[PDB]
Design a protein around this ligand. Structure first.
Ligand SMILES: O=C(O)CCCOc1ccccc1[C@@H](NS(=O)(=O)c1ccc2[nH]c(=O)ccc2c1)C(=O)N(CC(=O)O)Cc1cccs1
Lengths: 697, 13
């Protein structure tokens, strides 16, 4: 009877909605026993297999469904989602366009296509496709929330207040109905959701990993309870997809090699293949052991490998970011598993024991925002490799084109040696700053910049145009190598005014909200000649920011955009700003370290989420408490004072310049020692038979 | 990261 197979298939759909994936698979398969040529059952089964990580088996059943029913649009759209997850973007696009060709009113396919455009950098086409989806299916949480993020990306704030209301309403409805929220955990920090909602979002994304490991039917691992097998050494494993040219390596690449080999054995588990960069070379060479898990795609086999190495503390550096394989942590191959550095938020998941943070970033009164127990570093949990990667920025000189410290700037390893040959340099007390007068050499340098030349040679020294680093040494531009030449950086290179205050922010534009730009407008209005220096990320967001700024009373010429630059130029050109204005909604994290290493004071207002408090943690470690605001008024007053009291600005800039060296902020050796003390507190606690508890010392 | 997608569940009729 036809109702037999149909009933099994439709009941399975219900079980699937309820989260009973295993029962759904069973019913789908029974439906296929009763009715082998059941296209819908093939495609629905493939959908749950995809959810279980059985991607090749899913594809096989999608193809069967389409063999049975060549115009089965659902199967083409579902197959696209699976190909997308396999990184086959062209295959996904061909499936989605076939589905929409079959059924132009197919809302899900329009939304899935939009997700390709969104990920490809084609935000205008993504917005158009999501809007078609919502036109066809007005109640469509995935499409609405991903549309909302598109609009965030380009700073389209049309009806922003109503958008936030609906986002929170959608999440509340999904959490109440026990569904996976359509807001991604990494994005939840950007919206006015409660801490409970954000933690619940994270928990439910973490639960996705359980569906993928449960099918492995692996038992619990037996964990080490002493250091005898490791000759007294604590075995720490760092798991990351970002051992390579990625911000995470730019922060911690030095740490594996700085661990004390007498007390620690360091295992680095790469989730990504070797991208050929010096970052990957360094970690592979300096870690005690380096394991390329990209060659072991099965999470059961990969976890077995971790467990066979005897790891005591396994460190999750991805959280819910691209490249993560949190299934590895869900299997618990190690007795102690901690979040660290790579993800600014909680996992919400039972299989992570600790989050490594600090008292400034995550004060004990907000521990309820995290599912993990707090493990405090003594100063900040943040760290950066700037002292190793960009030592050419330790010193600088300027040209007195009339004295400014940030209009025409030279940096270089051989900069002092070069200045020795110049018998007329002036040393200015503010370490101190050499000033090249407007002489023959200075005119040649300025001519190089004005004429757009790549580099010149003076007294045998190479002097490089800071805009041309990729043409001179691509490895220097990326931070893989220290630049060898003397580099020239000027405000004229970026269209900045010579005679006015520059406030900068080099964050992704989605970290800006209307409230933040209103605050920045308030600051500019109080500093007559000041400008705001922002990043084209993406460029299509520029006219929106300009529109809203002019709407708030700021002429268009008050906001200056620059393109994304290579890593080294991005850090180096921070020297041209007077002050960095941090984003309160979600602080700069890497970019906060970058701006401080350039010596530029950063003004911040810490919020309540971990992501909104990182910059104040960095400034506390640096030792500049006067740059941390308690409310918007103080934030504006600090920025305006820096921009109007030029003697105070000189004092503050001098403080950052000096304390970036003397403070712990960039001291990777000290960081590793304190990190090691924290690991031992974790281990001694576990070794004594205790479950995880707050390591707040 | 990769934007999530929406699977379509087909009802048998
Ligand atoms: O927020 C965080 O802490 C990291 C977020 C995720 O970053 C990622 C992830 C994956 C691969 C690459 C990156 C970024 N690398 S980087 O941070 O070390 C870097 C490098 C050069 C840069 N040049 C500029 O002019 C301005 C910023 C900048 C930043 C990167 O390159 N970006 C630009 C791009 O992709 O074209 C992303 C940006 C981060 C902050 C502003 S933009």
């Amino acid at each position: 009877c036809p109702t037999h197979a149909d009933s099994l298939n439709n009941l399975a759909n219900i079980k699937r909605e309820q989260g009973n994936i295993e029962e759904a698979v069973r019913l789908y398969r029974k439906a296929l026993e009763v009715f082998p040529e059941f296209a819908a059952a093939h495609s629905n089964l493939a959908s749950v297999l995809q959810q279980q990580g059985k991607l090749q088996e899913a594809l096989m059943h999608y193809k069967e469904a389409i063999r049975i029913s060549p115009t089965f649009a659902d199967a083409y759209s579902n197959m696209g989602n699976t190909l997308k997850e396999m990184q086959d973007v062209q295959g996904a696009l061909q499936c989605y366009t076939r589905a929409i060709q079959i059924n132009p009113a197919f809302a899900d396919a329009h939304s899935n296509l939009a997700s390709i455009h969104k990920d490809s950098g084609n935000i205008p086409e993504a917005i158009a496709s999501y809007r078609t989806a919502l036109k066809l299916k007005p109640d469509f949480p995935d499409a609405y929330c991903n549309l909302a993020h598109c609009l965030q990306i380009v700073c389209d704030w049309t009806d922003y207040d109503e958008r936030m209301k609906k986002l929170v309403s959608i999440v509340a409805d999904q959490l109440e109905k026990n569904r996976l929220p359509s807001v991604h955990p990494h994005h939840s920090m950007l919206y006015p959701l409660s801490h409970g909602f954000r933690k619940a979002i994270a928990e439910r994304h973490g639960n996705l990993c359980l569906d993928k490991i449960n099918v492995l039917h692996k038992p619990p691992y037996e964990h080490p309870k002493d250091l005898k097998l490791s000759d007294g050494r604590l075995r720490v494993g760092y798991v990351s997809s970002d051992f390579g040219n990625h911000p995470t390596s730019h922060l911690m690449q030095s740490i594996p090699g700085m661990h004390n080999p007498d007390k620690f054995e360091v295992f680095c588990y790469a989730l990504s293949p070797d991208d050929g960069t010096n970052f990957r070379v360094k970690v592979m060479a300096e870690a005690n052991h380096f394991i390329d898990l990209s060659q072991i795609p099965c999470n059961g086999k990969a976890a077995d490998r971790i467990h066979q190495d005897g790891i005591h503390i396994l460190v999750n550096m991805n959280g819910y970011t691209k490249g993560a394989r949190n299934e590895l942590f869900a299997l618990r191959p190690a007795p102690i598993q901690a979040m660290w550095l790579g993800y600014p938020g909680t996992s919400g998941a039972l299989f992570m024991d600790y989050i490594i943070t600090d008292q400034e970033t995550s004060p004990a009164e907000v521990a309820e925002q995290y599912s993990e127990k707090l493990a405090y570093m003594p100063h900040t949990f943040f760290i950066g490799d700037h002292a190793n990667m960009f030592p050419h920025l330790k010193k600088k000189a300027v040209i007195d084109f009339k004295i400014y410290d940030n209009r025409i700037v030279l940096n270089g390893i051989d900069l002092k040696a070069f200045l020795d040959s110049l018998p007329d340099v002036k040393i200015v007390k503010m370490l101190n700053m050499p000033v090249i007068p407007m002489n023959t050499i200075a005119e040649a340098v300025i001519e190089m910049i004005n004429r757009g030349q790549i580099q010149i040679t003076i007294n045998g020294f190479s002097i490089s145009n800071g805009l041309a680093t990729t043409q001179i040494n691509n490895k220097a531009a990326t931070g893989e190598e220290v630049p060898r030449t003397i580099i020239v950086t000027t405000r004229s290179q970026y269209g900045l005014p010579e005679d006015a205050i520059v406030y900068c922010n080099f964050n992704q534009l989605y970290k800006i909200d209307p409230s933040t730009l209103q605050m920045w407008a308030n600051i500019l209005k109080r500093v007559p000649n000041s400008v705001l220096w922002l990043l084209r990320f993406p460029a299509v967001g520029e006219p929106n920011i300009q529109q809203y700024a002019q709407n708030m009373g700021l002429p268009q010429n008050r906001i200056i955009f620059s393109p994304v630059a290579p890593k080294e130029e991005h850090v180096r050109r921070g020297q041209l700003a007077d002050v960095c204005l941090d984003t309160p909604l979600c602080n700069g994290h890497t970019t906060g370290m970058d701006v401080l290493w350039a010596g530029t004071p950063m003004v911040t207002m810490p919020g309540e989420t971990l992501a909104s408090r990182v910059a104040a943690s960095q400034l506390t470690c640096l030792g500049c408490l006067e740059l941390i605001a308690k409310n918007r008024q103080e934030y504006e007053d600090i920025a305006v004072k820096l921009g109007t009291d030029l003697e105070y600005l000189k004092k503050v800039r001098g403080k950052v310049w000096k304390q970036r060296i003397s403070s712990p902020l960039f001291n990777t050796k000290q960081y590793t020692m304190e990190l090691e003390r924290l690991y031992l507190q974790m281990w001694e606690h576990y070794a004594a038979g205790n479950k995880p508890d707050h390591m707040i010392k | 990261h990769e934007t999530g997608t929406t699977n379509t569940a087909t009802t048998a009729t």
